[PDB]
Structure formats: C-alpha cells, structure tokens
C-alpha cells in the first residue's frame, strides 16, 4: 500500500521554520515524496538485515542503508561542508517519547558504567550422533512374554549412581550429583522413583534422627525443584510431608550442638516449603492447609520445643504480609514462654536452647515489622509492654538495621 506520512505533521514543521501560508497541495507534495524515501531506505535496510543475518536488528542497518544512498547516516545534525562528519555514523540519538527532556548533570555520572560483555569464543558439541540428536544442553529439547521396566539399563544405573552419590559419602560426588539433578533434561520418567526414595527415606530416617541423611535429602529436594524441565506438582503429595517432619517433629539429640545442625535443616525445610507451594498454588488447597496447620501448631500448649522452634521458623519465612498479620497478637505469649524456661535450675534439657533460638528468631522478625510499618521512638523501656524480652538490645539491633539502610 502507499500509506504516506500525515500532512498535518508537515504543516507544523513548515510553520515552525519560517515558511507560513503553505497550500494543501504544497503540503501533500512533501508527504508522498518523504514516505517513498522512508520506504526506499527501509526496503534497502532490509538488504543488510537479510545479508548480515542479524534478524534481531542491531541499531545500524539504517546507517548503512543511508550511506548506500549517498546520504549521511547522521541523525540530529547536518553538515553542509561534509568534512568533519562524512558517511561515518554516530550511532543515532538515544531519545524517548516518555523522556524527561531535562536531567541533572550529576545524574549521568551516577549512571553506572555497564559491563562490557564477553568476547566471541569457539566452543564445540554435537547436533547428531550417526542420525540421533543427543540431549545435551546445547540442544533444544496361553504362555506369554515378559514385560520390561520403563527405565533403560543405563537410566537405572544412572539412578543408582545418583542416589548413592546423594547420600553424601563424598562432597564432590554429592555436589556433582545435585548439579545433575538440577540440570538433567531427561530426568522425567525417573521422577516417581526419586520422589519415592526421598519420601520413604525421610520417614525411616526420622525413626533414628540421622541429621546428614536428612540434610542430603533436603538438598536433593532443592535440586529437584530448580530443574526447569520436569513437571513437579504431580509429586508434591510425597514432598511436603517430608519437609513437614523436618520442621515439626521431636528431635532429642545434642541439646546445643545438634540444635545448630538441625537449624540448618530447619532453614532448608522452610525455604523449600514455600518454593514447593509456589509451583502449584491455585485456590485454597496447599496455601490454606499450610496456614491452618502452622497456626494450630503454634497455638499448641506444652508443645515440644524442637517442634515449637521449627514451626516458628516455618511461620516466619512466609513473606512480607504473613508476619504482618500472624506475628502480631502473640507477642505476650512468646514472652511468657521465655520467662517459664528462665525460671528453674534445669539446663540439661533442650527446652532452654529451644527458647533462646525461638526468641532470637521472633525478635529479628519483629525488627522489619518495626522498620517496615512503624517509626522508631522510645527504644528504652516501651518494649517492656511486650514482656521485656529484647528491649534495649532489640533497639540496638534496630539501630544497626537503620545504619545499614543509611549505608544503602
């Protein structure tokens, strides 16, 4: 079609130059001619796009199409003497429609220098091995007979090697295996056997609280989740229960030493819990179950303090609003529990260690709630209205957070 530029834009340009009182036939004369030149160049810039095999187009085809038609590719200035700026281009003008039209000179020094990317290098692979395309990451995707297992003899050997490496006898083995679990494209159709190995393992691995066996299985869950190829929400009925017992069970090992170890498993569990729910959250179901169960676990009375600490951590890592609504009306209860452990001379229990960990975690979460939607003031004895747990030390932590914010 001969869709030309509008003539009511050409009269604006003419009267903003000193040429007033132009006729419509004078003004139409320019539009047909100008549209052809734009059409002549865009058909000629198409040559450089097809020959450079650019496709995505790097700001520059019109610069060579203009130079081909013996017109300067310069945009934003025309030199009638032609000598300082010949047919070499200046890369156009980085201008916008929604721009500010007047910035600060100090703002452009603040503009960070972008990183120069990597230089062009030659790496080699395989599109086809004697006719078959490999699944490497450089590639896109009445007596009767006996049945066969749906896994190959190699795939089954791969499953055995990956599972015997993921029980963490050697770090190198476990790490490489975890990477393979997080990158294998063909790890679907083996995923029932991995989910069953995880689920079954945690349940017979909490009969005796074997922390490594559990920390390795949680890392296997995390390596299963970030794999982009496999479809996971047909198997989370076996995953969530595993992370649940890694957070809300009775763990009676070393009171202080194992608390550190089991708190790393707690961190893993709370993180992988939200990611699992994120991959399947539609309406109610998983999110509703998690919220109701966590609330019931918290409101339990005389609850094991290991279970208490794990459920506290799980409730805390749920995001911005969840602690904004679920960690408000229970501040008095948390203080009462800490006071109960403080009274008495018994220290050979895990109840005291559990109490210290719970109080520290709750106090840090309160700090963003104080920072996010409150203004600091009276940081000396106002916290005594919240049983006086962290008080001035909590105020000092808030001050350190404010200093970090000032540094940012």
């Amino acid at each position: 079609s001969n869709t030309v530029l509008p003539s009511e834009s050409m009269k604006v340009v003419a009267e903003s130059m000193g040429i007033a009182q132009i006729q419509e036939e004078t003004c139409q004369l320019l539009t047909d001619e100008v549209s052809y030149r734009i059409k002549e160049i865009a058909q000629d810039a198409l040559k450089f796009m097809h020959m450079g095999k650019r496709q995505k187009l790097t700001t520059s085809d019109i610069d060579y199409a203009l130079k081909l038609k013996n017109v300067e590719p310069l945009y934003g200035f025309h030199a009638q003497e032609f000598i300082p700026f010949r047919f070499a281009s200046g890369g156009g003008r980085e201008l916008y429609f929604y721009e500010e039209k007047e910035v600060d000179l100090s703002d452009i020094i603040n503009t960070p220098l972008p990183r120069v990317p990597l230089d062009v290098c030659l790496k080699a692979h395989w599109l086809s091995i004697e006719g078959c395309q490999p699944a490497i990451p450089e590639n896109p995707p009445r007596l009767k007979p006996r049945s066969i297992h749906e896994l190959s003899v190699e795939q089954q050997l791969y499953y055995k090697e990956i599972t015997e490496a993921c029980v963490g006898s050697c770090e190198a083995k476990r790490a490489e295996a975890l990477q393979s679990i997080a990158t294998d494209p063909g790890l679907y159709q083996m995923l029932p056997r991995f989910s069953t190995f995880i689920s079954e393992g945690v349940r017979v691995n909490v009969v005796q609280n074997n922390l490594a066996l559990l920390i390795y299985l949680m890392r296997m869950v995390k390596a299963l989740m970030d794999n982009p190829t496999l479809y996971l929400e047909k198997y989370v009925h076996e995953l969530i229960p595993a992370v649940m017992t890694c957070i809300v069970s009775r763990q009676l090992c070393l009171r202080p030493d194992v608390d550190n170890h089991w708190a790393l498993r707690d961190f893993a569990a709370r993180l992988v819990a939200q990611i699992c729910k994120h991959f399947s959250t539609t309406t109610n179901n998983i999110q509703s179950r998690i919220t109701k169960t966590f609330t019931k676990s918290w409101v339990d009375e005389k609850t094991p303090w290991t279970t208490r600490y794990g459920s506290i951590a799980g409730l805390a890592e749920l995001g911005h609003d969840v602690i904004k609504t679920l960690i408000l009306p229970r501040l008095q209860q948390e203080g009462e529990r800490i006071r109960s452990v403080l009274d008495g001379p018994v220290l050979s229990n895990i109840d005291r260690i559990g109490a210290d960990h719970v109080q520290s975690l709750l106090l840090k979460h309160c700090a963003p709630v104080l920072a996010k939607l409150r203004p600091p003031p009276d940081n000396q004895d106002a916290y005594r209205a919240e049983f006086g747990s962290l008080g001035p030390l909590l105020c000092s932590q808030v001050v350190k957070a404010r200093a970090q914010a000032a540094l940012q």
């Binding site: 349940r203 909490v206 009969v207 929400e233 047909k234 198997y235 989370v236 009925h237 995953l239 969530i240 229960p241 649940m244 017992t245 069970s249 009775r250 399947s280 539609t282 179901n285 998983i286 179950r289 169960t293």
Partner: peptide
C-alpha cells in the same frame, strides 16, 4: 472449575500431616 486438572493434583487432594507416621503406633 471441577474438571480443572489442577484440582486432581495429588498434592491438592492429600493432607500431609496424616501422611507422616510421626513415631505413632
């Protein structure tokens, strides 16, 4: 709504608290 395949996702049809034996006999 009801025929929606997500509803039949085994995670959205199973309560995990009951799944765990949790040292119970």
């Amino acid at each position: 709504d009801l025929l929606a395949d997500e509803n039949f996702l085994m995670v959205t049809q199973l309560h995990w608290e009951d799944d765990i034996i949790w040292d119970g006999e």
